[PDB]
């Protein structure tokens, strides 16, 4: 039944109790006491001297004291190493001492015939000093810290409240549990009693029945102790359990929490008396871990992406990385950063919002480039804000070819509007993508340019392009020179080889070029379903090559796939219709962005999408989020934007003032009311009647109305501002309230 | 990526809660000494103390804030079998109306969303939820308890639905902390049929078998479905797709045991993308979602 303890005088000095006593310092051992084999009962000296001095009672029951400290002039050695056997041989049961007077100490033994059992002896510096309870079992021996002539004992089936000054004077109370009887220093009226897996709690002033009863856990409770630096906290330990359950005694419901100081079974858990709620657990495998159990933790978030958590008494806080790297933190931080950078609001050239958004995100690349294209075309021009589906819904006049002619206006014009919107064809009617290819080669995207050329049927120009790209910055020329095997042979070395290698490539554009070259006639499903390649280019190539019936399958399938997956790059297909709204709903459900949802919808919306109950909720919730930022002026600017781009929104409902004679509103002689021409109110300061005429400044701010919402006293803005700057009372005589400070 | 710090505040007794107002400039902490106190962050980033006053006989567990539109009030519950309100007069707070109608310890108090008025919901250990009303924002000295809901179990925590879209009827979630050997649902949801003008049981989560410590609702921000987190042995996140009470499509999204203990508190962000959870392990673990729509940890703090 080993346990652990520390030095009552030295916090860092700890004792490991085993078959051999070991003393360690906080772990590095100090000494190994193997002179006491087969230990039964252990006690420590209440007095400081001697250091590392203890009292041990083995099965023989003799009162023997052993020490481990190094003392050069120890004051009390005649008791150090001393032995005090009983008058009969009873096994060791319990042992304790009184810190009030260290001279007297009490020990408990097993059942002899009629000799002493609860024998108290002074170690001096033969026989017990005070004795009682002959021929009985003393499960526990203890001393009352407060009353130096008081103690609590436990018989075989009873517990008695006796006194030293009168041996026969005692108060015995019947109970079933007499194990682990102790009273915490703070709780002078609280007693304890353990019964296997059950624990019995009783009040000293009500020591007749158990005040509190705990649940009987399956494994018996081994050790139960009170918190040495906490109020109303007790812990009970069981057998071969990783976590020791505990109860809260500060209620007067008791909160039950269990803490596991280790992942293995621990023989006993002992809390250091000096340390503040720090517990030490000892296991049979000679491993000691000091785990300080913490209390319940509260949490509270903040609108600045900051978390405040209370762990006990102290207050702590967590910040937002502040690294300017990685994933740019949570969506809220990016949202605030964009709002502070005036994001979306800059509408003179649309595409700049992709750099204005901060980092490079491909999702917020297709949206703003598509939105720039739609606005740019309609300025020159349901036309653009309809998507590719509506654009090619009535597509007619497409002719396929079995074999490409190696080596654009021949297409139907409405089928060329899709090409124009897909970024290939310029604004003009020229079928020469020359500027697009030149810009691509300038941008360094050599593989993309090669793909565009191959789609445009310039094999030699593409070869020159690849050679030029590989001139600067080695496998590019390798693929390019390899590429010249294209043919229409049934079993060409080029054909079988490229069909094999089409999946062997690394660059998606090179893979797409290989697939197109090796594509069987008629079926081009290899290119059109490369999810690792741009949606834009695939859609444009399909429009350029596929026929009438083989476009209404691909467009619809791609649109459903993009809508289900929530890819923002499909807005070009969906357009600004109900389908686009569903796509944006999926995007918001995924990412949680409402600026990219609010600013996209307000950009050229016919008065059917804006009426949706969904397209208004995102704007309202973004405005509320801006309110949380306390970004008032940014919200005001966004309100200007929304109001000028959405007639359905009705501005705030506020107060208007009304005349006293006409009874009607004054909002559109200036001093005269417009209703029936009866005098308007006047400033309390100027005594001049109000009024405002309903580059040259027509009606300055200083002449506006302003009134106290508790007084209904009013005047010019400027005079009231001046008056309340130096004074603090209602301007009118006999008025009382302090008008300004009511709201500030 | 979350880094910690230390806040310059001194207390005597252990505190049980912290709660910001709506902007993040006023917190309200309740101490074990029956004394609640309100801090106020200044322009220099420091925290000062503005008020303090002892509460009723019991022990306060919860203190909550209110929307700034309605003034500045706080609701606090304690073992005194009463719920309180407090308003600033300038700063000396004043009791306005102690909603005392409970025969048990009112464990939780929460405020209804702004879009419907000044309501507050409380239920006690008896297992009956109460909804109160202030149908005059002028005077707070008059309240009415319209609906009483039988739970046939105990209460641990409750949470409203932040969503304010017109489609969603008002909703409430009632937990339980009963460890009876039998197995029964410990988290249930009620709706409000305007036709019947009453609160009706809508859906319950049968997968919940152990006692529940706390429940929270993730704010909507224009989403289609709902997000709900339940404190149990393991943190769990459920989503209830809308289809008498409306049928709900329920499917789990996460189940986390990275605590080796019992979860105590659950919280949500303003946006509703990061979850903060605290447990008996002495650590605070924050969970966010990744590109694969997967729920994983982001920082373990202690
Ligand atoms: Zn008039
Ligand atoms: Zn006045
Ligand atoms: Zn004036
Ligand atoms: Zn006034």
mmCIF file of C-alpha atoms in Angstrom, chain B:
data_model
loop_
_atom_site.group_PDB
_atom_site.id
_atom_site.type_symbol
_atom_site.label_atom_id
_atom_site.label_comp_id
_atom_site.label_asym_id
_atom_site.label_seq_id
_atom_site.Cartn_x
_atom_site.Cartn_y
_atom_site.Cartn_z
ATOM 1 C CA UNK B 1 -1.702 30.060 -36.179
ATOM 2 C CA UNK B 2 -3.220 31.461 -32.991
ATOM 3 C CA UNK B 3 -0.751 32.987 -30.529
ATOM 4 C CA UNK B 4 -1.584 33.780 -26.919
ATOM 5 C CA UNK B 5 -0.928 36.717 -24.603
ATOM 6 C CA UNK B 6 -1.807 37.919 -21.104
ATOM 7 C CA UNK B 7 -4.491 40.439 -20.126
ATOM 8 C CA UNK B 8 -3.685 42.943 -17.366
ATOM 9 C CA UNK B 9 -6.526 42.282 -14.938
ATOM 10 C CA UNK B 10 -6.528 41.333 -11.256
ATOM 11 C CA UNK B 11 -9.275 39.426 -9.456
ATOM 12 C CA UNK B 12 -9.669 37.797 -6.062
ATOM 13 C CA UNK B 13 -12.111 34.915 -6.511
ATOM 14 C CA UNK B 14 -12.461 32.435 -9.350
ATOM 15 C CA UNK B 15 -14.591 33.782 -12.212
ATOM 16 C CA UNK B 16 -17.156 31.793 -14.195
ATOM 17 C CA UNK B 17 -17.762 33.670 -17.469
ATOM 18 C CA UNK B 18 -16.678 36.429 -19.838
ATOM 19 C CA UNK B 19 -18.919 38.086 -22.428
ATOM 20 C CA UNK B 20 -18.412 40.892 -24.938
ATOM 21 C CA UNK B 21 -21.247 43.251 -25.792
ATOM 22 C CA UNK B 22 -21.573 43.517 -29.580
ATOM 23 C CA UNK B 23 -18.453 45.434 -30.597
ATOM 24 C CA UNK B 24 -15.768 44.041 -28.318
ATOM 25 C CA UNK B 25 -15.321 46.906 -25.855
ATOM 26 C CA UNK B 26 -17.188 45.763 -22.705
ATOM 27 C CA UNK B 27 -16.838 42.451 -20.884
ATOM 28 C CA UNK B 28 -18.815 41.157 -17.916
ATOM 29 C CA UNK B 29 -17.224 38.601 -15.588
ATOM 30 C CA UNK B 30 -18.912 36.941 -12.617
ATOM 31 C CA UNK B 31 -16.723 35.940 -9.675
ATOM 32 C CA UNK B 32 -17.117 33.216 -7.071
ATOM 33 C CA UNK B 33 -17.644 35.976 -4.475
ATOM 34 C CA UNK B 34 -21.127 36.739 -5.900
ATOM 35 C CA UNK B 35 -19.580 39.892 -7.385
ATOM 36 C CA UNK B 36 -19.962 40.773 -11.070
ATOM 37 C CA UNK B 37 -17.784 43.473 -12.615
ATOM 38 C CA UNK B 38 -17.630 45.190 -15.996
ATOM 39 C CA UNK B 39 -14.423 46.165 -17.765
ATOM 40 C CA UNK B 40 -14.151 48.704 -20.573
ATOM 41 C CA UNK B 41 -11.365 48.628 -23.146
ATOM 42 C CA UNK B 42 -9.984 52.102 -23.799
ATOM 43 C CA UNK B 43 -8.480 53.780 -26.859
ATOM 44 C CA UNK B 44 -4.986 52.687 -25.793
ATOM 45 C CA UNK B 45 -5.915 48.996 -25.702
ATOM 46 C CA UNK B 46 -5.885 48.794 -21.902
ATOM 47 C CA UNK B 47 -8.593 47.286 -19.713
ATOM 48 C CA UNK B 48 -9.994 49.273 -16.795
ATOM 49 C CA UNK B 49 -12.611 48.486 -14.170
ATOM 50 C CA UNK B 50 -15.781 50.565 -14.185
ATOM 51 C CA UNK B 51 -18.240 48.937 -11.773
ATOM 52 C CA UNK B 52 -18.793 46.072 -9.342
ATOM 53 C CA UNK B 53 -21.619 44.942 -7.047
ATOM 54 C CA UNK B 54 -22.649 41.836 -5.140
ATOM 55 C CA UNK B 55 -25.523 39.758 -6.508
ATOM 56 C CA UNK B 56 -28.249 37.672 -4.857
ATOM 57 C CA UNK B 57 -27.806 34.851 -2.357
ATOM 58 C CA UNK B 58 -26.971 32.087 -4.826
ATOM 59 C CA UNK B 59 -23.881 31.566 -6.959
ATOM 60 C CA UNK B 60 -23.841 33.241 -10.373
ATOM 61 C CA UNK B 61 -22.921 31.049 -13.331
ATOM 62 C CA UNK B 62 -23.950 33.047 -16.412
ATOM 63 C CA UNK B 63 -23.801 36.719 -17.388
ATOM 64 C CA UNK B 64 -24.895 37.753 -20.891
ATOM 65 C CA UNK B 65 -25.008 40.992 -22.872
ATOM 66 C CA UNK B 66 -27.643 42.664 -25.039
ATOM 67 C CA UNK B 67 -27.867 44.402 -28.377
ATOM 68 C CA UNK B 68 -26.859 48.092 -28.179
ATOM 69 C CA UNK B 69 -30.086 49.172 -29.898
ATOM 70 C CA UNK B 70 -32.112 48.324 -26.803
ATOM 71 C CA UNK B 71 -29.804 50.146 -24.391
ATOM 72 C CA UNK B 72 -27.265 48.292 -22.235
ATOM 73 C CA UNK B 73 -28.650 45.438 -20.128
ATOM 74 C CA UNK B 74 -27.313 42.141 -18.787
ATOM 75 C CA UNK B 75 -29.094 38.981 -17.674
ATOM 76 C CA UNK B 76 -27.539 36.861 -14.938
ATOM 77 C CA UNK B 77 -28.783 33.666 -13.297
ATOM 78 C CA UNK B 78 -27.753 32.054 -10.019
ATOM 79 C CA UNK B 79 -28.843 29.414 -7.513
ATOM 80 C CA UNK B 80 -31.116 32.042 -5.920
ATOM 81 C CA UNK B 81 -33.872 30.702 -8.223
ATOM 82 C CA UNK B 82 -34.035 34.090 -9.943
ATOM 83 C CA UNK B 83 -32.961 35.894 -13.109
ATOM 84 C CA UNK B 84 -31.860 39.520 -13.115
ATOM 85 C CA UNK B 85 -31.493 42.534 -15.396
ATOM 86 C CA UNK B 86 -29.241 45.572 -15.042
ATOM 87 C CA UNK B 87 -29.219 48.970 -16.788
ATOM 88 C CA UNK B 88 -26.624 51.763 -16.821
ATOM 89 C CA UNK B 89 -27.591 55.145 -15.375
ATOM 90 C CA UNK B 90 -25.020 57.868 -15.981
ATOM 91 C CA UNK B 91 -22.352 54.826 -13.695
ATOM 92 C CA UNK B 92 -24.628 53.176 -11.126
ATOM 93 C CA UNK B 93 -26.463 50.071 -12.319
ATOM 94 C CA UNK B 94 -30.007 49.445 -11.103
ATOM 95 C CA UNK B 95 -32.127 46.356 -10.685
ATOM 96 C CA UNK B 96 -35.186 46.585 -12.923
ATOM 97 C CA UNK B 97 -37.123 43.306 -12.705
ATOM 98 C CA UNK B 98 -36.026 40.065 -11.050
ATOM 99 C CA UNK B 99 -37.819 37.396 -13.079
ATOM 100 C CA UNK B 100 -38.504 35.046 -10.162
ATOM 101 C CA UNK B 101 -40.852 32.246 -11.210
ATOM 102 C CA UNK B 102 -38.662 29.133 -10.866
ATOM 103 C CA UNK B 103 -38.752 26.417 -8.204
ATOM 104 C CA UNK B 104 -35.230 25.232 -9.100
ATOM 105 C CA UNK B 105 -31.792 26.598 -9.899
ATOM 106 C CA UNK B 106 -32.036 28.469 -13.203
ATOM 107 C CA UNK B 107 -28.920 27.145 -14.917
ATOM 108 C CA UNK B 108 -28.836 29.200 -18.127
ATOM 109 C CA UNK B 109 -30.013 32.580 -19.421
ATOM 110 C CA UNK B 110 -29.760 33.713 -23.055
ATOM 111 C CA UNK B 111 -31.002 36.624 -25.149
ATOM 112 C CA UNK B 112 -33.186 36.355 -28.232
ATOM 113 C CA UNK B 113 -31.998 37.784 -31.560
ATOM 114 C CA UNK B 114 -32.525 41.467 -32.233
ATOM 115 C CA UNK B 115 -34.983 41.085 -35.121
ATOM 116 C CA UNK B 116 -37.886 39.976 -32.889
ATOM 117 C CA UNK B 117 -37.693 42.135 -29.760
ATOM 118 C CA UNK B 118 -36.498 41.829 -26.163
ATOM 119 C CA UNK B 119 -36.933 38.201 -25.141
ATOM 120 C CA UNK B 120 -34.804 36.068 -22.831
ATOM 121 C CA UNK B 121 -35.011 32.321 -22.240
ATOM 122 C CA UNK B 122 -34.306 30.498 -18.977
ATOM 123 C CA UNK B 123 -34.798 26.962 -17.753
ATOM 124 C CA UNK B 124 -33.962 25.450 -14.375
ATOM 125 C CA UNK B 125 -33.175 21.999 -13.031
ATOM 126 C CA UNK B 126 -36.896 21.226 -12.833
ATOM 127 C CA UNK B 127 -36.887 20.888 -16.618
ATOM 128 C CA UNK B 128 -39.177 23.731 -17.724
ATOM 129 C CA UNK B 129 -38.079 26.448 -20.147
ATOM 130 C CA UNK B 130 -39.504 29.955 -19.833
ATOM 131 C CA UNK B 131 -39.647 32.766 -22.398
ATOM 132 C CA UNK B 132 -39.999 36.367 -21.228
ATOM 133 C CA UNK B 133 -40.988 39.555 -23.014
ATOM 134 C CA UNK B 134 -40.557 43.315 -22.710
ATOM 135 C CA UNK B 135 -43.320 44.752 -24.889
ATOM 136 C CA UNK B 136 -42.296 48.301 -24.064
ATOM 137 C CA UNK B 137 -38.626 49.104 -24.677
ATOM 138 C CA UNK B 138 -39.288 52.247 -22.617
ATOM 139 C CA UNK B 139 -39.627 50.671 -19.174
ATOM 140 C CA UNK B 140 -37.847 47.431 -18.306
ATOM 141 C CA UNK B 141 -39.811 47.034 -15.054
ATOM 142 C CA UNK B 142 -42.528 44.910 -16.710
ATOM 143 C CA UNK B 143 -42.116 41.453 -18.254
ATOM 144 C CA UNK B 144 -44.435 38.629 -19.297
ATOM 145 C CA UNK B 145 -43.820 34.866 -19.361
ATOM 146 C CA UNK B 146 -45.746 33.684 -22.416
ATOM 147 C CA UNK B 147 -44.660 30.105 -23.069
ATOM 148 C CA UNK B 148 -43.611 27.358 -20.674
ATOM 149 C CA UNK B 149 -42.051 24.268 -22.251
ATOM 150 C CA UNK B 150 -41.874 20.889 -20.537
ATOM 151 C CA UNK B 151 -38.611 19.061 -21.215
ATOM 152 C CA UNK B 152 -39.160 15.742 -19.364
ATOM 153 C CA UNK B 153 -35.462 15.968 -18.407
ATOM 154 C CA UNK B 154 -33.029 18.512 -16.981
ATOM 155 C CA UNK B 155 -31.321 21.548 -18.522
ATOM 156 C CA UNK B 156 -27.635 22.190 -19.050
ATOM 157 C CA UNK B 157 -27.440 24.793 -21.828
ATOM 158 C CA UNK B 158 -29.646 26.486 -24.417
ATOM 159 C CA UNK B 159 -28.959 28.478 -27.570
ATOM 160 C CA UNK B 160 -31.068 30.442 -30.048
ATOM 161 C CA UNK B 161 -30.703 30.586 -33.819
ATOM 162 C CA UNK B 162 -28.826 33.708 -34.985
ATOM 163 C CA UNK B 163 -30.418 33.366 -38.437
ATOM 164 C CA UNK B 164 -32.699 36.269 -39.355
ATOM 165 C CA UNK B 165 -33.973 35.242 -42.791
ATOM 166 C CA UNK B 166 -37.754 35.377 -43.035
ATOM 167 C CA UNK B 167 -37.973 31.705 -44.035
ATOM 168 C CA UNK B 168 -36.650 30.387 -40.724
ATOM 169 C CA UNK B 169 -39.137 30.259 -37.876
ATOM 170 C CA UNK B 170 -37.715 30.873 -34.386
ATOM 171 C CA UNK B 171 -35.814 27.905 -32.975
ATOM 172 C CA UNK B 172 -34.381 26.854 -29.624
ATOM 173 C CA UNK B 173 -32.144 24.020 -28.442
ATOM 174 C CA UNK B 174 -32.462 22.451 -24.993
ATOM 175 C CA UNK B 175 -29.777 20.186 -23.568
ATOM 176 C CA UNK B 176 -29.579 17.803 -20.650
ATOM 177 C CA UNK B 177 -26.980 16.711 -18.101
ATOM 178 C CA UNK B 178 -28.620 13.579 -16.711
ATOM 179 C CA UNK B 179 -26.384 10.508 -16.402
ATOM 180 C CA UNK B 180 -29.226 8.055 -15.797
ATOM 181 C CA UNK B 181 -28.329 4.469 -16.802
ATOM 182 C CA UNK B 182 -31.030 4.551 -19.474
ATOM 183 C CA UNK B 183 -30.285 5.911 -22.942
ATOM 184 C CA UNK B 184 -32.334 8.775 -24.358
ATOM 185 C CA UNK B 185 -31.832 11.811 -26.557
ATOM 186 C CA UNK B 186 -30.251 14.603 -24.527
ATOM 187 C CA UNK B 187 -30.481 17.403 -27.133
ATOM 188 C CA UNK B 188 -33.809 18.509 -28.616
ATOM 189 C CA UNK B 189 -35.041 21.334 -30.849
ATOM 190 C CA UNK B 190 -38.324 23.248 -30.776
ATOM 191 C CA UNK B 191 -39.902 25.390 -33.486
ATOM 192 C CA UNK B 192 -42.736 27.927 -33.468
ATOM 193 C CA UNK B 193 -45.734 27.362 -35.733
ATOM 194 C CA UNK B 194 -47.289 30.786 -36.268
ATOM 195 C CA UNK B 195 -50.621 29.134 -37.081
ATOM 196 C CA UNK B 196 -50.826 27.380 -33.711
ATOM 197 C CA UNK B 197 -48.963 30.293 -32.058
ATOM 198 C CA UNK B 198 -47.041 27.869 -29.849
ATOM 199 C CA UNK B 199 -43.693 26.103 -29.578
ATOM 200 C CA UNK B 200 -43.665 22.505 -30.812
ATOM 201 C CA UNK B 201 -41.063 19.768 -30.605
ATOM 202 C CA UNK B 202 -39.419 19.520 -34.015
ATOM 203 C CA UNK B 203 -36.429 17.166 -34.019
ATOM 204 C CA UNK B 204 -34.186 15.360 -31.552
ATOM 205 C CA UNK B 205 -30.719 13.881 -32.009
ATOM 206 C CA UNK B 206 -30.918 10.184 -31.137
ATOM 207 C CA UNK B 207 -27.155 9.741 -31.546
ATOM 208 C CA UNK B 208 -26.716 11.690 -28.292
ATOM 209 C CA UNK B 209 -26.603 9.221 -25.392
ATOM 210 C CA UNK B 210 -24.237 10.717 -22.800
ATOM 211 C CA UNK B 211 -24.818 13.860 -20.718
ATOM 212 C CA UNK B 212 -24.406 17.140 -22.601
ATOM 213 C CA UNK B 213 -22.554 20.154 -21.210
ATOM 214 C CA UNK B 214 -23.124 22.977 -23.703
ATOM 215 C CA UNK B 215 -24.822 23.703 -27.038
ATOM 216 C CA UNK B 216 -24.293 26.522 -29.539
ATOM 217 C CA UNK B 217 -25.643 27.595 -32.929
ATOM 218 C CA UNK B 218 -23.323 28.807 -35.651
ATOM 219 C CA UNK B 219 -24.392 32.162 -37.123
ATOM 220 C CA UNK B 220 -25.975 31.959 -40.547
ATOM 221 C CA UNK B 221 -24.362 34.708 -42.655
ATOM 222 C CA UNK B 222 -26.684 33.864 -45.534
ATOM 223 C CA UNK B 223 -26.083 30.110 -45.700
ATOM 224 C CA UNK B 224 -28.775 27.633 -46.674
ATOM 225 C CA UNK B 225 -28.562 25.106 -43.818
ATOM 226 C CA UNK B 226 -27.746 25.347 -40.100
ATOM 227 C CA UNK B 227 -24.653 24.413 -38.080
ATOM 228 C CA UNK B 228 -24.821 23.118 -34.509
ATOM 229 C CA UNK B 229 -22.094 22.059 -32.074
ATOM 230 C CA UNK B 230 -22.735 19.847 -29.040
ATOM 231 C CA UNK B 231 -20.480 19.408 -26.015
ATOM 232 C CA UNK B 232 -20.183 15.773 -24.917
ATOM 233 C CA UNK B 233 -17.337 13.342 -24.325
ATOM 234 C CA UNK B 234 -16.420 14.396 -27.868
ATOM 235 C CA UNK B 235 -17.025 17.636 -29.744
ATOM 236 C CA UNK B 236 -19.589 16.999 -32.489
ATOM 237 C CA UNK B 237 -20.916 19.265 -35.247
ATOM 238 C CA UNK B 238 -24.288 18.637 -36.900
ATOM 239 C CA UNK B 239 -25.992 20.341 -39.841
ATOM 240 C CA UNK B 240 -29.779 20.422 -40.245
ATOM 241 C CA UNK B 241 -30.976 21.019 -43.805
ATOM 242 C CA UNK B 242 -34.547 22.334 -44.029
ATOM 243 C CA UNK B 243 -36.868 20.160 -46.091
ATOM 244 C CA UNK B 244 -46.395 21.444 -38.207
ATOM 245 C CA UNK B 245 -42.651 21.436 -37.592
ATOM 246 C CA UNK B 246 -40.429 21.378 -40.653
ATOM 247 C CA UNK B 247 -38.682 18.102 -41.395
ATOM 248 C CA UNK B 248 -34.914 18.334 -40.996
ATOM 249 C CA UNK B 249 -32.188 16.492 -42.891
ATOM 250 C CA UNK B 250 -29.617 15.670 -40.203
ATOM 251 C CA UNK B 251 -26.134 14.341 -40.912
ATOM 252 C CA UNK B 252 -22.939 14.598 -38.883
ATOM 253 C CA UNK B 253 -19.914 16.486 -40.188
ATOM 254 C CA UNK B 254 -17.344 16.042 -37.420
ATOM 255 C CA UNK B 255 -16.564 13.978 -34.319
ATOM 256 C CA UNK B 256 -13.502 14.958 -32.303
ATOM 257 C CA UNK B 257 -11.802 13.136 -29.452
ATOM 258 C CA UNK B 258 -8.591 15.201 -29.335
ATOM 259 C CA UNK B 259 -9.179 16.037 -25.673
ATOM 260 C CA UNK B 260 -9.143 12.708 -23.738
ATOM 261 C CA UNK B 261 -11.632 14.323 -21.343
ATOM 262 C CA UNK B 262 -15.133 15.793 -21.091
ATOM 263 C CA UNK B 263 -15.862 18.955 -23.066
ATOM 264 C CA UNK B 264 -17.181 21.890 -21.043
ATOM 265 C CA UNK B 265 -17.730 24.950 -23.256
ATOM 266 C CA UNK B 266 -18.322 25.546 -26.965
ATOM 267 C CA UNK B 267 -18.230 28.878 -28.790
ATOM 268 C CA UNK B 268 -18.500 30.286 -32.310
ATOM 269 C CA UNK B 269 -17.118 33.224 -34.268
ATOM 270 C CA UNK B 270 -19.035 36.185 -35.665
ATOM 271 C CA UNK B 271 -18.776 34.696 -39.160
ATOM 272 C CA UNK B 272 -19.286 31.129 -37.944
ATOM 273 C CA UNK B 273 -16.153 29.395 -39.225
ATOM 274 C CA UNK B 274 -13.943 28.783 -36.160
ATOM 275 C CA UNK B 275 -14.966 26.782 -33.088
ATOM 276 C CA UNK B 276 -13.285 27.213 -29.709
ATOM 277 C CA UNK B 277 -13.678 24.394 -27.190
ATOM 278 C CA UNK B 278 -12.410 23.991 -23.631
ATOM 279 C CA UNK B 279 -12.148 20.803 -21.609
ATOM 280 C CA UNK B 280 -10.887 19.139 -18.435
ATOM 281 C CA UNK B 281 -7.535 18.497 -20.142
ATOM 282 C CA UNK B 282 -6.614 22.116 -19.418
ATOM 283 C CA UNK B 283 -6.257 23.142 -23.061
ATOM 284 C CA UNK B 284 -8.246 25.199 -25.565
ATOM 285 C CA UNK B 285 -8.421 23.715 -29.062
ATOM 286 C CA UNK B 286 -9.676 25.757 -32.016
ATOM 287 C CA UNK B 287 -11.118 23.979 -35.045
ATOM 288 C CA UNK B 288 -11.430 25.409 -38.549
ATOM 289 C CA UNK B 289 -12.373 23.922 -41.919
ATOM 290 C CA UNK B 290 -9.926 23.098 -44.712
ATOM 291 C CA UNK B 291 -10.116 23.146 -48.502
ATOM 292 C CA UNK B 292 -11.378 19.553 -48.582
ATOM 293 C CA UNK B 293 -14.353 20.689 -46.465
ATOM 294 C CA UNK B 294 -12.721 18.799 -43.591
ATOM 295 C CA UNK B 295 -12.852 19.829 -39.935
ATOM 296 C CA UNK B 296 -9.414 19.807 -38.295
ATOM 297 C CA UNK B 297 -7.624 21.582 -35.472
ATOM 298 C CA UNK B 298 -5.784 24.879 -35.830
ATOM 299 C CA UNK B 299 -4.278 25.559 -32.398
ATOM 300 C CA UNK B 300 -3.984 23.910 -28.978
ATOM 301 C CA UNK B 301 -3.604 26.563 -26.288
ATOM 302 C CA UNK B 302 -3.189 26.341 -22.527
#
